[PDB]
């Protein structure tokens, strides 16, 4: 509740906030869904202004073709953050962030469910494909 | 089977539940297709034998409520266990820690399979 | 976006040998299947060696004529049978806490991956399934 959003963007607005908690600087991925998908890059174009608002250096509008930013919290399965070596004491904090991050993936699965088809009582995709 | 549907005759209340839960407020239980009525625990429903919802008393099916769809919703924010500096671990705990985060996963796949399905 | 643990290689005539990039925890957690008229599942110790750590030497040389168009494989981690279970000590090992955290990292990932895998946004909606019945043309 809720990882994936889309805002609304028009030009000269560049400061958009994150509702979730991110747990690592790279886990936010920021894509102007636009007409077409475009992934944005951690320093070139958006900087985290206050750890909870994403500033934008370039203030994109609909007029160069793009609405809107979709920011999900993609959490990698391979880049695990907590590794237990031979001791190397277990702080409780180590065991905490290990069970914290794996819940973060599991909840990201529950906001994947809204962004495929949906039943309206089915979607405005231009294509469905390979049959 | 993290979510199941239960329609039944009226003034009966002794539903059995499997999935199996961790906290009693994870079971959310609903009233159906005319409305989306979500009833609360202590105004309405206890659990009696820790596997039955024993409901409240009647409702069914007559008030447009045909009928109950109880389900798991585990909260992903309120972790049941916070590990602290020792404050020693119990082996029950080290399991239940990883047990809960596997249950969001079993929850998450199954409501996606209810739209267009796999099989 | 993007599927990390289900993958569909082009079977492409006689090619015996494909790679598996994701971090499968045990041998039996990878199920390989055959696509193209059927959904053929093929058992390990006879029909295909694990070539190496990361490679499936499939024996032999299926498709596409004589039936199957794409070898695909996915992870299936058992979400019930946990792999190391902690009892009273029984000292905590680095291997024990990791594999326990490794496994539940997969089950949440295998969930999130499976949810795109059914019908979901291609990087438009996708997959080579039959989309069995919708029952009316309007």
From Swiss-Prot, chain A:
Top-level taxonomic group: Viruses
Stretches of the chain forming a coiled coil according to its record: none
Record localization: Virion
Cited function: Structural component of the short non-contractile tail. The tail comprises six fibers made of gp17 trimers, 2 nm in diameter and 32 nm in length. May attach to host lipopolysaccharides (LPS) to mediate primary attachment to the host cell.
Subunit structure: Homotrimer. Interacts with tail components gp11 and gp12.
Family: Belongs to the Teseptimavirus fiber family.
Name of the protein in its database record: Tail fiber protein
Natural source organism: Escherichia phage T7 (Bacteriophage T7)
Taxonomic classification: Viruses, Duplodnaviria, Heunggongvirae, Uroviricota, Caudoviricetes
Residue span relative to the full protein: 5 to 138 of 553
């Amino acid at each position: 509740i809720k990882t994936v959003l889309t805002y609304q963007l028009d030009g000269s607005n560049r400061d958009f906030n994150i509702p979730f908690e991110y747990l690592a600087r790279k886990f936010v991925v920021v894509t102007l869904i636009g007409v077409d998908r475009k992934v944005l890059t951690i320093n070139t174009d958006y900087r985290f202004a206050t750890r909870t608002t994403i500033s934008l250096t370039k203030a994109w509008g609909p007029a160069d073709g793009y609405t809107t930013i979709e920011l999900r919290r993609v959490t990698s399965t391979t880049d695990r953050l907590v590794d237990f070596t031979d001791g190397s004491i277990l702080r409780a904090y180590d065991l905490n962030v290990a069970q914290i991050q794996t819940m973060h993936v599991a909840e990201e699965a529950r906001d994947l469910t809204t962004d495929t088809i949906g039943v309206n009582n089915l979607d405005a995709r231009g294509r469905r494909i390979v049959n």
